[PDB]
From Swiss-Prot, chain A:
Residues with the N6-acetyllysine modification: 28, 47, 130, 181
Residues of the full protein shown: 292 to 589 of 707
PTM description: The N-terminus is blocked. Phosphorylated on multiple serine and threonine residues during apoptosis. In vitro phosphorylated by PKC. Phosphorylation stimulates binding to DNA and D-loop formation, but inhibits binding to RNA. Phosphorylation of C-terminal tyrosines promotes its cytoplasmic localization, impaired its binding to polypyrimidine RNA and led to cell cycle arrest.
This protein's UniProt keywords: Acetylation, Activator, Biological rhythms, Chromosomal rearrangement, Coiled coil, Cytoplasm, DNA damage, DNA recombination, DNA repair, DNA-binding, Immunity, Innate immunity, Isopeptide bond, Methylation, mRNA processing, mRNA splicing, Nucleus, Phosphoprotein, Repeat, Repressor, RNA-binding, Transcription, Transcription regulation, Ubl conjugation
Subunit details: Heterodimer with NONO. Monomer and component of the SFPQ-NONO complex, which is probably a heterotetramer of two 52 kDa (NONO) and two 100 kDa (SFPQ) subunits. The coiled coil domain mediates interaction with NONO, and can also mediate formation of long, linear homooligomers (in vitro). SFPQ is a component of spliceosome and U5.4/6 snRNP complexes. Interacts with SNRPA/U1A. Component of a snRNP-free complex with SNRPA/U1A. Part of complex consisting of SFPQ, NONO and MATR3. Interacts with polypyrimidine tract-binding protein 1/PTB. Part of a complex consisting of SFPQ, NONO and NR5A1.
Protein name: Splicing factor, proline- and glutamine-rich
Entry function: DNA- and RNA binding protein, involved in several nuclear processes. Essential pre-mRNA splicing factor required early in spliceosome formation and for splicing catalytic step II, probably as a heteromer with NONO. Binds to pre-mRNA in spliceosome C complex, and specifically binds to intronic polypyrimidine tracts. Involved in regulation of signal-induced alternative splicing.
This protein's domain notes: The coiled coil domain mediates interaction with NONO, and can also mediate formation of long, linear homooligomers (in vitro). The coiled coil domain is required for optimal DNA binding, and optimal transcription activation.
Amino acid sequence: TYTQRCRLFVGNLPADITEDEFKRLFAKYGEPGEVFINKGKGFGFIKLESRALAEIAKAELDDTPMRGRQLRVRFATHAAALSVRNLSPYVSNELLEEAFSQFGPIERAVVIVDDRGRSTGKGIVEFASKPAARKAFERCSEGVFLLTTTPRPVIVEPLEQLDDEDGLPEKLAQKNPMYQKERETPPRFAQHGTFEYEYSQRWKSLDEMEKQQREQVEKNMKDAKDKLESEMEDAYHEHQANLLRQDLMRRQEELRRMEELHNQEMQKRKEMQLRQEEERRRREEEMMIRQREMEEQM
Amino acid sequence: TYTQRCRLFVGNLPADITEDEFKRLFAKYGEPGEVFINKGKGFGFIKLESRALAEIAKAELDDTPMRGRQLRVRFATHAAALSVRNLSPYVSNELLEEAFSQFGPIERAVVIVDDRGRSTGKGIVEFASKPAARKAFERCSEGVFLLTTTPRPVIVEPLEQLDDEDGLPEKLAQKNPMYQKERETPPRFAQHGTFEYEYSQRWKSLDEMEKQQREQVEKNMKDAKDKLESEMEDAYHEHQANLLRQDLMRRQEELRRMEELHNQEMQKRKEMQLRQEEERRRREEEMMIRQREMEEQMRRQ
């Protein structure tokens, strides 16, 4: 709770603002966490309990009157967030949280997944503190970090956060003079043959060429990295197979020598049975040789 | 109310779901909006009362046991979303909204701002309907669409919506022989001189190579596009004067015609008086001879 995600920013505060005065505004939405206000410039930060309350706060407090000035309550950007890539499809949000926990405390760690359900090999690591992220970056940029059994490395990059609430409105846009020259012509579909239609087709074909030449390098390096990826995944699998084949050869020789040394004990046992058959017949011969003499004895 | 943002995506449903069964689950959440259920793949979109009330329906219905498969109700991604690149730094949120409304209805329009609040040259458009976004791309597939005076073509690209909230947890992670084999080794740091370190360091060098091959292709393709700008702007600044010289020569010969006919009339004004002083002089000569002819004629008889 009270994560940087729920953290908010308040603009257009009056120059005569106090700490307690500020906190009060958001008191009707729960309990105020981390507070940072710069009275001079007139901006303040507030950490809320959940992102749910953060949504309530902005919807009710934006543009509200406060000593003339109309307040600008906006969401604060996560300055402890990072971008991780090169991840295995087996890598989970929990495992990534377990992984980066060693650098500092983790607020939220998420592995980006596609619409179907499959992983994207890109993750988001958000920290409790900014120096924990800077430490995690330096350690992983110079040194090598890893998660799974397969030595697939993790590249930590600073998160490129994009704006979808503020942008650039006409009110604070028409402040330039070229704006007059540029805005003079309204939006329309171009007509064939014109001096402006030549650029509209000559530049458009350069982008089609750019996108393809960009995608060319993408596939070009995809396969080149896939060499090292498949070379270790295929041949280092043989290292596991080689040790297993050696165990199969060792286990075979134990059964082989037992079917050679202990098998002779049942082969030499049949010899005694053959010897007893020879004995009984020879016993009859001795009794018949004696009786030949017994007939001649009487 | 009942907008895309309020909308929720549903997945992982069984073969028993119907039009009446799907309504009952959303009957408790105020009143059901847009009802559209697919039988083949199992997916759809339903509008909610508000963004805040949608988040409550999101968290409660997620990972609930319902006839085997777990209900994936995650922030429904905005479909029909289109990312526009190459925008003039003089294009606003309000201007971009009214520009893309020509094709269909626009739910949200935003021009991407940089760290100093200025234009990046990229923007986000949020279409309401699927056929309007298709037609919007179709207009930028066969022909072009311009927004400003300078012919900067608005390169419309299809935005990729990825699941960034739910992710891939262990609670719903699939079982396979590699899934439990890779897990056996805990997350570690590679040691100096080891093979695992050597392969990874040599793999990270291919990424250093991929970055350099991208950073250079970004610049070398920008300069080629930068040289096309000067090949058509400096050509126009020489054409504007060339077309002005056409009207200037037309307004120069306009006076050469005016002066020539005034010269023809001035040559005439003098020619009229030249012939007047030839006639009126010959009359003085005519009257003189006739007089002196009759003198010598009478001097005889």
